[PDB]
Amino acid sequence: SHRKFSAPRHGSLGFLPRKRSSRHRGKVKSFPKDDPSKPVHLTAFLGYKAGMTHIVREVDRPGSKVNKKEVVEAVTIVETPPMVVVGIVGYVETPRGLRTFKTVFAEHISDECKRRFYKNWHKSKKKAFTKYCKKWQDDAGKRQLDKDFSSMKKYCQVIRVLAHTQMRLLPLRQKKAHLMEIQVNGGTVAEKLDWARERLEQQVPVSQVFGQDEMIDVIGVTKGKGYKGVTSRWHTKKLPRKTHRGLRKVACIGAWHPARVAFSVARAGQKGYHHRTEINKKIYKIGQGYLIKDGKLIKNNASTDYDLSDKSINPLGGFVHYGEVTNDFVMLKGCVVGTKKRVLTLRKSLLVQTKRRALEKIDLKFIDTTSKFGHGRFQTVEEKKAFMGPLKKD
Template sequence: MGHRKYSAPRRGSIAFRPRARAKSLEARVRTWPQLAGEKNALLGFAGFKVGSIHVLTIDDREKTPNFGKQLLNAATVIATPPVKIIGVRAYKTDIYGQHAVFDVYAKDLPKELARRVEIKQAEDAMSKAEGKVAQASSVMAIAAVSPSAVGIPQKKPFVFELAVSGKDVKAQFEYVKGILGKELKASDIFQLGQNVDVFGITRGKGIEGPVTRFGVKRKQHKSRKSVRAVGTLGPISPAVVMYTVARQGQHGFHQRTEYNKRILLMTNTDKDGINPKGGFKHFGLVTGDYIVVRGSIPGVPKRLVKMRHPIRNLPKKVLEPKVLEVVVE
């Protein structure tokens, strides 16, 4: 080992530990932004990943060398069927964290919902909830989206929580109460040209070694016994392998967040011609509402992705992108 240097840069970010399989196919949104203004609105939405296309736009980023010129953007299509608001939940916060104060569900819920949750509530549940709103510190909307709405053969819907903007808890409750049992579209929550944060579960790749999993260097061909292994696991004493050492293990199928993905297209018709001949690979034809965001997003086609209003680098104004052409492979 005399030919090797005594130190090397560490490989692989510790920020992504533990690199274990995600517990669920549904990503969790742990933090929600606070929108400016007193208007109450939902802060997130959900859809299903479709595939990739290219969108030709005019670069509207000022103070860049490409400003005003044509820009070919790699983009991702997300099918966004309407989301049904099925309930409202209030939380109170103490030194031990958040605790649910009450749940109230809408009447005449879809039959498929019974495959996911069993709902039993009293007839006067809403009136009781109105008396407990003063105890709450935040209000969340309980939403459901059905994969069958975009042609995915899964009857069981996804149920998740969406935060509500505004600091007045009573106003948040009244807003969710007003949309209870209704269906909302992506255009009711997001606007064309704004940025969104995308949450998803990445493509699983199974068990991989340290070269693929962490990017450590291969040893030279004359190395002893192994080439695609770490040079050393640590000192002889103490006889402990630190958790920072690159080892083999699960690669992929992790929850990841992509920040500030700009919405290039948002429509409910195929006037832009985003469907390739024969449909998207592993998905098919997009016939309903969809969003096209700039760049890539985590996951495989048909997998649920969640979106929220951006939490970083909020822009002062939202500009609609100047789309020239949609290039479908």
Template structure:
């Protein structure tokens, strides 16, 4: 007898499955502030994957205290520059930017991305934001940062990627003072994250173009007589006559991939500055050599090599801080087969 249990193929959670607007992923929420003031996010470029041999330090694990092989993603993280401070005010329509201050002497490559605002009245604008904070007209302070891919040999571009980052601090005044101290400066990944901590990753996935419903939604192939009539990889019906339109819930062909995806609680296994420690023989496929700062993330990360990856303080941190892992070996075997 046939089973009457048949879950829906695919998921409607990510609909509409269309291409992302930008290759730069967005964070729409930020975790609550803890500890000393700092930026809550950083950015890097995906290099590839390898594996490490480490001591399992997960409590109550079946392999606790034993040597295990763990897949890791290598992300090259050149320094980022803080370009501006942005003040937000909240009203009935939500948060809106009410003031911003841009730093002077920014990198000339930034002009390739946006028309850089003049920094003639920087001191005056900073004073105005300070007054607005005292008057209670500001609800949040955020930082505008950009990457410097010109220092990377594996990423063939010079145009920076601009993004906005939250600031972790006890109150608005502390946020503002910290933002002023880093305005126009370069920050490295060690200024934001530490080895062993958890982060959230966001990236745009690998684009796969137009795909049929079998690959895109995971529907079953037609069987028996239906398959012999030329309808092997199609759905059985587009829906009823009435309502007289095709529902968006019907699994059809269309765009697959190049969507933004956020993954939570990824562990940083290592932060290093010598790329030779992780570069395999012959370099990484479709990337080349790692020459500067890098981060090893446990597990996989969305997107192809060279794709911009954003890292954020964990917004749903449930695991205890495991501390720095004991890495015994990093595989540098050739990835070229």
């Protein structure tokens, strides 16, 4: 018979085999469409979720009940130190698909990077690319290198650049820079490929790729939650108190007769650590990192035109389970998938963004710097110190 009292189904099938991701680093599953007209540029970048905080701002959507009212608003910080382009890589279109074609690498590649070509650097003799970089210092090779490029200049349709992170600069424990292919969408294939050839062994910082007040798409792997029961996994109803074998279950699996159980029925398995592609995370700010001229310029980070203090985004006592974000960073509105220290793939949108909300320009009045390791009440040490006075440890 039918179901007496309807309800929607729990979960969405369009996300499943609810399995532990194969990857750790979030793949850009689809870059946006190149055109011609608009200059070459990368389409994406690679970051590290440090943590979160408030922001205060005036808000200018006329019509609202919040119009030119300040609000507080959540943000993530994503520690995003400049990438290095090491290789390029051409893709040819085919009726099968999009076959990879011709991969050049640079002369020099950092150890940061070369780590990733070994499971075990301690043990390894560190011999990768030794016999390759020979090419870059003779005639014969250097000619073949040009032919390898000029082939791509004729044939290949799509050219992405390979880059890697500068793992060095992050507080994180690992030394193995994540590599990545990042797509160059811009002018003709030659022009494209020439731009990449100029960028080889070279830095590419965040600002070059993304701009402020820009909707981007975060991709990254979810915070992982082990095996779980159907209840926390699928958010099916808990059964009632009296229930002789378990109540954090799904009473009936299937009906009798299609007498298998279906993929559509809620079972217990891996919760979290899925691969996920969020979209539309605005960029409330892109901070310049630390640097010097005579003394430090730490001020420039969490400072605003309405605060003008000397704060870093680094809250008191560091970002928790992370460290000091010394480098440049992007400050997305809201949460992003995945956990502290996670390698987080930012990407330009696939989408023509033309909505009131998605074009609003941001002007922050205040970035909250208060400790995250307890109910913090002081923005910065200087302030705390004055408030309390001197102590017994003096």
